[PDB]
Amino acid sequence: GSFVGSIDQGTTSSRFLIFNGEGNPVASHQIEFENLYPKSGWHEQDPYELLNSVQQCIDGAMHKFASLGYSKENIRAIGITNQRETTVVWDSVTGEPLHNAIVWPDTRTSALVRELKARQSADSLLELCGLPLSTYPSSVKLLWLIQNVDAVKQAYEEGRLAFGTVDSWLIYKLNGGAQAERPIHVTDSTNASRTMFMNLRTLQYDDKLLGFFGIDRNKIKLPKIVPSSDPEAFGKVATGALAGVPIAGCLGDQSSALVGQCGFSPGQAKNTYGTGCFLLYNVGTEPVISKYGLLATVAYDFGRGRKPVYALEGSIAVAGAGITFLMNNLGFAPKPSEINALAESVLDNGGVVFVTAFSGLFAPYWIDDAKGTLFGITQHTTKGHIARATLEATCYQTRAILDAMEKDSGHKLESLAVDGGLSASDLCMQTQADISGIPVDRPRMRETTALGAAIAAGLATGVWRELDHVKESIAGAREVFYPKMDRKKAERLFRKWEQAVEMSRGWVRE
Amino acid sequence: GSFVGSIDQGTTSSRFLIFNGEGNPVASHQIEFENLYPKSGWHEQDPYELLNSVQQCIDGAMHKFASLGYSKENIRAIGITNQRETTVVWDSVTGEPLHNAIVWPDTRTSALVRELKARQSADSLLELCGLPLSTYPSSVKLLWLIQNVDAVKQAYEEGRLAFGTVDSWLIYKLNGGAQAERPIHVTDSTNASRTMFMNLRTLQYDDKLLGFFGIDRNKIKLPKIVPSSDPEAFGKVATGALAGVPIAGCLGDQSSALVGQCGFSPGQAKNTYGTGCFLLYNVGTEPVISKYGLLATVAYDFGRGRKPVYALEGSIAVAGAGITFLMNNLGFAPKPSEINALAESVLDNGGVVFVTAFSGLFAPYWIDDAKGTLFGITQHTTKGHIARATLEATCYQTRAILDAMEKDSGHKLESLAVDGGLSASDLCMQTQADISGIPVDRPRMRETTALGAAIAAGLATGVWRELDHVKESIAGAREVFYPKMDRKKAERLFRKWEQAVEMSRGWVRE
């Protein structure tokens, strides 16, 4: 085989891509799928909607792959990357779902979270798994399912409840599920680090963590934790257009994006833009527990003797949602490209600062009583000024998180790569370079997340020997944005932002 | 002979010592000499005040060595240890200095430093020589002397400029200067690793580095880089009371201190206390370039078919200067022992934390916009609480550097030896033991720096055969401080220190 495939199963879409030995994609196919919102704050997906979304993406890509004259016999292996924390529960016996998957943004577990935070044993969870208690981790999601869904209750007590993040589910069913010789139930170190069940330092399940949530190892079937790159642990695709092709790579989507940007050295960071932002910061071979509310997580675990690598993670809630706000809520323009144009139409922000704290501010600010607050409005303020401030808001929060990441880890920021969404805005990336004082790399190959899983698979099957080889091959209409602004003008702009953040505190009273 | 002599030429004093075969001094003589400070931030010494001082200690100590019944015939060899980075320039053909030596803390090179740091070239220096650009290394001091002192630039162009660190200067004159048959112009690997001229991995001058500073090796006379322990490369003392005694050892003072503590295995560290601290960390035969602003230097190069050993170095500005601050600035007490008594008169710090960032904080924090910040004051805070917080402040910063060295090198801390100044405070060292969680070793033999050079000369000439022999022979108030505190209580104290540090950054706005 000479090519590597990659399944990228996201929150709203699935895609399948096939890469060559240099990381460039030759065949691709994407599929939107249905998300379900039974009540406000609830968010679920049919596990079979996710799987068949993937099989229709494989089918579509390989028809295009076939039109170029290639066969499955040429795909050496595939990797999998997936939306993290999304929780699937199925019957160990029949491999059938016992409930809809609860997707990571679901908030039905709020009450449960407040309950678990009132424990005293909760004080020590951050240090053991790298994450604080919240509505996101798979643990609170699965505990809620057991305590509130009877068919899940029975299976747990009867000893036939199987748990998995989306990666585990996909690999299980792709191998054949219950109807299979050598059934495959596993998860890689990056996905398993998002559940709150795993010790971050040992990369093994921890009974202090399991016991805190009342989950019994010897009742529920937990996926076995394996490296993110392995030639055997994930098995092979049993059926379909890819029958007989081995699965050899598996990575959480935000980890896969960092791998796809070749952020393999301490201090190399990546920002993925969608409705919001996910930022990851390579910290090396020793995990770093945050003093600022950042998440400590696994960057990648490629094995073959090498030590696993960790990362710090931060997130912003409002990045592309800011543009959506300007277009729909305020009616500035009907397309995001015309929003950029309005921003480029003015020289600067006109003194406007948009603290886009629609649901408050998160790392590193942790301000829960502020709402969206717009400063600096005069009779001379125009839509372009506000559009600029909306872009800058994302860049200011990005610096705030990267600053925290430098302080948490002690490494100076070495590089910043960007992909997705708002990264297409030259103006926004240029502002990020200006505000942070660092080159901003934006690859032209836009499917960075999927490439990460392809690298993981290629490394397990000999397409690439080491990570130097990965960098060399990948390296081998604009790419890098370089700072233009005086560093003292940059601090001044950033200090105005922080003044506005402090002034936004205390809006919501009770 | 069975005895070994050691020249310890310090920043403000010279001393000559004679050690027996188990590392105990049998004769000593010390002389304070003249430093000079024409302009603020300038620091100079007459190269003959340094050598004359050395000669007077040799004379003074051999007069006492005679009272014991011994003479130069009983001294197998002598070694030399010295203030590092201090730059000496002299004329090749006459052997007379061209200008006063520039002591290492001189700051006249700052402008030139920011000149050379602006070049993209500078990024490659640290990985090349293990050091970043600063005002300390001899490179910028020599370049300044060439670019700004005509007597030196003229000797440079006329091909008779000779450069040397103090070690090289002393060995050259002791051997007889220019009139000597077989003139000796050399420097040991540890001293040469402080100039920024030497490749750290190869222990040879590097044209790439000499080029960066515009230094022509076919025009300037650089000292030959030799091992720290050699029975012939340093020659012999030409005249005086040690006429005929070979010189066979040479180490930078901080490196000599590590040797004198027998810090020979990876992970063994030492700390020397004065106005501040110099910490060294043995990392083994493979050099380690720091991610946290620490310096990569040579620990010792003992030759004899053994690979050289490297180390990581960190420095703290405020250790004894903190005690001095409490006495003079705040008037707590006229003597240091009373400051200590005040700290001992309370059970703990009373919640007080003193971030002693008088001119900011340095490795591994690197905070340039913080001043001294005292936290936790109530109407119950007394001098003793603030005295304790001052001592803990240097221990906290000490732990922060040792943690950074562990992470950089991969080697767990095996031990910590202390010497000088504040190490005499039983309380401070017990506090360090409590905070770091390991035993703290403090030799009753106080002259650890001078022992290092004696060890080098002894290994060169058979007094000690191997490094194991050294450890055994020198294994023969108080000596060892053991942790009297949980890791959990210690971690709480360190977290509040790090919180104080975080709350101190951002004080200076312009």
Residue numbers in the entry:
A (entry chain A), B (entry chain B): 65 to 540, 550 to 583
Paper passage:
Here, we report the first structure of glycerol kinase from the thermophilic filamentous fungus Chaetomium thermophilum (CtGK). Overall, the CtGK polypeptide chain can be divided into two distinct domains classified by Pfam as FGGY_N (residues 65–325) and FGGY_C (residues 331–583) connected by a flexible region.
We initially determined CtGK in an apo form using ethylene glycol as a cryoprotective agent. The physiological dimer is not contained in the ASU but completed by a symmetry-related chain forming a rather elongated assembly (A:B’ and B:A’). A similar organization was observed for the later structure obtained in P2221 (both chains modeled for the range 65–583 with a gap 541–549). The dimer interaction is mostly mediated by β-strands located on the C-terminal domains. Although crystals were grown from the same condition, the collected datasets were processed in different space groups.
